[PDB]
Design a protein around this nucleic acid. Sequence first.
RNA 1: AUUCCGGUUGAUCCUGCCGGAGGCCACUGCUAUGGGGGUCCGACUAAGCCAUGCGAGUCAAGGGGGCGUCCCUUCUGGGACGCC
Length: 226
Amino acid sequence: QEWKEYAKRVLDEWEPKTKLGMMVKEGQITDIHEIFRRGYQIKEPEIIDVLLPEVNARENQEVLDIALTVRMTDSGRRVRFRVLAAVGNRDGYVGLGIGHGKEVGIAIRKAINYAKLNIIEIKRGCGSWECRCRRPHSVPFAVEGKEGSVRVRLIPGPRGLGLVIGDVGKKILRLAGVQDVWSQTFGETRTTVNFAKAVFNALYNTNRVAISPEMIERYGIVVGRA
RNA sequence: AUUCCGGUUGAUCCUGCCGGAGGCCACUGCUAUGGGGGUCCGACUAAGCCAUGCGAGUCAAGGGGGCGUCCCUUCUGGGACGCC
Ligand SMILES: [Zn+2]
């Protein structure tokens, strides 16, 4: 219950500034599923700390890309660090973020904060021909997501099959809780930022697919926590 | 595993090729304790050329002969089984 007591400490010594922060602090909101699909803005990392306190674990925190960028000036070179990171719990909830700094540590901190701010909620299940089980071990059905030039299609896979995707998408899916999947990617996958954002968009798009009431039972669809 | 990674810029995103990464066959450096199973080993260039030995024989119950043994009447001539 270390994460639970961490959440209690945050809720104690946190002073809300936004409407959603006030809702959480006063107690109108108790479960993270309430802050989604309502149009609210998440601008305080303390909200995510309180509602998903496990995202602060190192095992649940993943730094994806570190890049050095240069600005030219009459004096010389101005170096800056761009860090692309991802956080989340290994059940339904994942987030991705970008941070910039004069130092790698500052960039990492800002990227983690922005990933927490951008956290989303996904849907999991099983819709593969070779599995036909009813567990949230893979994506419920085939989805697509594109960022820039990279197009990523995620397809359900049989239980026990590893994550057949690049390293970046593999880490993102592992943080999101998905365990088995097949992938088809087109475009420049070496662009880590675009690849990660395409995987993130593909995971998010699971909520854009209309489904029938019986499909939930058929595919074992689970929203957010399981 | 229905996968990616490095490389064009002071820095970025694309198109595009090259390389890395896996499997199979052929030649080859270094090195090598065993035992089993298999449809492996002068096909790639010369279906180019070959010393020597062997790789197609069998039948005496189709036929007449020769050499040897035996049984012999006994100069006669007859019968067999061995080899040719
Ligand atoms: Zn399944």
